[PDB]
Amino acid sequence: ATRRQLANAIRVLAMDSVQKAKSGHPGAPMGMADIAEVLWRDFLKHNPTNPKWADRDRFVLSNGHGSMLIYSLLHLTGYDLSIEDLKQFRQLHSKTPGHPEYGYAPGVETTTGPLGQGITNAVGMAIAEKTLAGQFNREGHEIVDHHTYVFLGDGCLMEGISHEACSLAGTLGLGKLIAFYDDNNISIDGHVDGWFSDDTAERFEAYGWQVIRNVDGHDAEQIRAATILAQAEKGKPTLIICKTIIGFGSPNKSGSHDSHGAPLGDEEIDLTRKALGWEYAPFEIPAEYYAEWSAKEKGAAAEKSWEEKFAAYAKAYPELAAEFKRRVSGELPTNWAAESKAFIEKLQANPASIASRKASQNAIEAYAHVLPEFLGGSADLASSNLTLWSGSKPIRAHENVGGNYINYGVREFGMSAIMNGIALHGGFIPYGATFLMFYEYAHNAVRMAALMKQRTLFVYTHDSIGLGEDGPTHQPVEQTASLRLIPNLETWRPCDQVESAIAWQQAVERQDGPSALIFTRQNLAQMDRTSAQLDAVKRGAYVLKDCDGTPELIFIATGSEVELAVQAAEALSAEGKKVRVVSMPSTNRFDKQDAAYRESVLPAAVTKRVAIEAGIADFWYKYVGFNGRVIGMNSFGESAPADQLFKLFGFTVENVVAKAKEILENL
């Protein structure tokens, strides 16, 4: 078959699957099929029988609405994705959801859909390849060597996150990143000139990318020539601008947004088959086409060759090879359990009153000696977030290439989605920090990490009005509660240096999802814990101060407000009242405990509960109920020194005691 005939197999599988589903986007798959045929058949290094081969090239479909493009490519080249799977497009519990989801189909490298995060994940994947190569490759043993390929569209380039990711990609000289731009002059609102008129070539040249302009996206020889010059450029990422016709082959809907996101219809599909010269019924692919699309034989030989290279590498570098396999698998070092425990116990036995952001740095310093896979960073806030340790080596294009730290610049969304790509790639545990407030810039990347069950460590410092004079644009109020609502994210707001080391430990051990670690600017007093209390911190909430017998009142506190809760409990106790203090470093972790443990912390029979947190109050009714009270925030902050703000907003022993006594008096 001809290259165009092979590409048409994608076009027809796409429009037939959308039609059977009565749902989906036929246009971009049809527009990009010729580019896909060249890239997948001539260049992409992959093995359909092992989609987890460590040295495979990574392909990312950033215009994720064109999901039938990747589904067709995976089916045609030999992956474990069947015609029956394509017939279940957009159906409940199928392998082929409306937007491609990591973990659902073999060979989908990332979950896309939200525009701009695809290319940003890919930037992270290319950073991880370059850094892993810098850490593990040796002379004669280039065991890390693979490209990162991206398809992207107009929406992706309009999104601000594309500017964050691609500006950084150029600075870091990601020569193995090659992106194909689907330049079809179409978005949902119509022909894009009215709202999108960048000179995109000049924009990307300004980032330090190589740009190959004006490629005919339906001419295989041109796509091939451009890909060759893209691969020959070793120092810069490359953008190949492909001129395509959206919905190529449709006589009445091509070149128009009418083909972007609706079924073509039975009549138009017939007219398309004829304009394409495609004579086979829906979901029928001739055996000849499967034979020429198959990547099984080329892929198996590529991996067997890499396995032989790795075998020889392991003889020369036995510890590197073991570390490679360990880190790529995501397992922790065998001494991790004992050294992290010993560090946490040392802190419990050597009290220090420090800011939890300092405790965070101390934890990084200790754990980084055990975890060479740490790949840390900050969005231009290293000296405020305290993310550097004594062994930090900031990565640059030609310096510290096997380093372990990224100066992300002022790019919270880009950093967060890059970290997702780093986590997806394997070999690293990424962490990256900013101020808690600017979680809101990166919000959807955090949710994406949770949806993809990726171990990405989101570090946030300056967590409340405790930060003081920078004022209400910076002082978080509702941000912690908002992070707590993200399914499959575990949010930690530790109350001293010990809870801070335990939150880091729990985040590192959480391999099926991300964590958010929230730290303070101001000093926090360390709480006393018995061995059993120390063991219970990782359960998310535990009894910190207890009375003899059933409590008449329970204080629930997190983070910097735990000392206040303890002091108010002391005052009430000196009046003969029986009060319990529960510290709740992670509401998410506590919610997962069995009902016996939760009842032992918050007994159902004790309904007089006071929650204390310098955050939005509405969150806490889940734990205090109608008979409880929340000592929280219900407004934006103010610019003033922190001690005056804590008094202004009621975080005083007098106020807490007074509010507690009101519910004890049933008022």
Next chain:
Amino acid sequence: ATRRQLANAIRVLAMDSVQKAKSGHPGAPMGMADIAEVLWRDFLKHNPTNPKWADRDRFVLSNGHGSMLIYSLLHLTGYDLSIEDLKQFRQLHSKTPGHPEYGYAPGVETTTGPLGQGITNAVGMAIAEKTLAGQFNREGHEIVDHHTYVFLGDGCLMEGISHEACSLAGTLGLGKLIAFYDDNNISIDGHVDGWFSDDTAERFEAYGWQVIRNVDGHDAEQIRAATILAQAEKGKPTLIICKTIIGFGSPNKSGSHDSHGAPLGDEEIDLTRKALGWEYAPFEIPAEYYAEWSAKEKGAAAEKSWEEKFAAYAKAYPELAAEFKRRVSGELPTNWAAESKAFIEKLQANPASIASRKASQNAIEAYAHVLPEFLGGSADLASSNLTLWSGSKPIRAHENVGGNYINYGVREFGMSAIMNGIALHGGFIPYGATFLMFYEYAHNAVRMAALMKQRTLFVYTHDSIGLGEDGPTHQPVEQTASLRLIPNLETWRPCDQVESAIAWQQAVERQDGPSALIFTRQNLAQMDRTSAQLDAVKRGAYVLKDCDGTPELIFIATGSEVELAVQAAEALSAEGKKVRVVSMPSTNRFDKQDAAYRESVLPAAVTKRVAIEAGIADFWYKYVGFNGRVIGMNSFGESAPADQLFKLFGFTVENVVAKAKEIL
């Protein structure tokens, strides 16, 4: 005094005010003082005695950490901002908070701090000036004509939102937008080459801006020359790239991130004074420097000249002039109360089972006939969000310049912060739509509108698993609850075309803060309402179905789930149980009602409550407590037809009734 001596007044006030607070950022004010002297003394058209002069130029400090720069300028040029105010920098209730706040000091045009949003607000103000000029100017009567000036630094240019805002600004040809880039090679991590190496000039030329390269930021003559060329360019926004030395004047910390964000120290301040030849004690500005900095005489003449132009305009176009004054003040038209009421009563009388996104478009259509100040838009989703009405005139650089709609492209964050600038400018009520999921892209701009108490209307469609097959990356679950947590935002989730029209009405009428209006893709059944029920919808929650006497079970539902709550209540009432259905289209609005009203709707003695909402369940404990139940979500969605998703996730009458019996 020389120009440099006048600029040094900014430098010494900045560093002395930061030193007294023991907090703040001296470097950028010190780095930009010469630029600010030129722009404010030679070019800025403004009146310190009336910071609300409608035709004033707009200045925006996008690198807002340098707040002492704008406070010094305001103090020096004669605004109502005193030395005593600068002495209260960063102190409780001062007019000089650590980042400039709109309304806290006269002459501050927007609240900055979150990097990138200042320039994006300024793109919004430049769009509003251009569009308002297109609507109101007449031959011989150019009553709208003013520039938008921005200071911005490396952080702003690194942020993705700057790419959204400046791309659109070039496309719309905002010739009166002029930005000065504080190109000082410094950010908090240090010298920026290791993480920021853009060819910024070529980047902005790719957006269609004019770029003046390599201006010496400490040479008043070059700054003046660059600004003249920026003003001469009428068709494109201009970026003036000013090479500056952060902390200019400090011998030990200039050109270093050491001067970015901490007091210089008493000793370093003394050496800086010596290096600058500055001989006056802290907070002492000689009378001669005040006289030469004063904008009072120039500004009063400029406003008087404009008042005379407006008087001539009002003589020729009395109705137009009265519309200008009404729309700039923010007051609604006199017939608004009656027209909106008649529209809502008409919908209650002619039931239709339509998607609330279609109900939203119908409301836009009816209200836009009454509100010429509407400036609508969508982030590349006009056909899905349904934001166009029959009178929509999409604004372009040279077409529909007096239009009323913006194709924002795929730029949710930039859209939202541009809308904030449009609201700050005056003359418009901006609304803008995207899918509910992608408010997470625009999150902090929504918060900033609430912080600034701006009437910005954030429209969201496709609000639940109800959108169906696009799957869990698009299906909101926790987004509505997160919107509800934002102080001073009112979030509405209406259950039918009638609640949809009332939600738009209340958002339009809310002058002191923003609204989020959340609409469905799937059809919603209209509910029966008496005249008193119809009137109570604007109280945020109300009794929709009531039993006789005290109920033993209260259903609380919102949006698309109210019909399910009605259906389950009818099944339970047919069994003899006393059940009430409460529709709660806005939790935030309801929370602000007086105690008597709230008790009338949710009596405290009825503790058996079931909340129903296709969103994160944990939010609703505030209203149901320990002994209630939530028919909610606690996971991500799935890619499948909507009808199957509602069954899969338990949004069925049988499931709701089962959970109601668990507490009865």
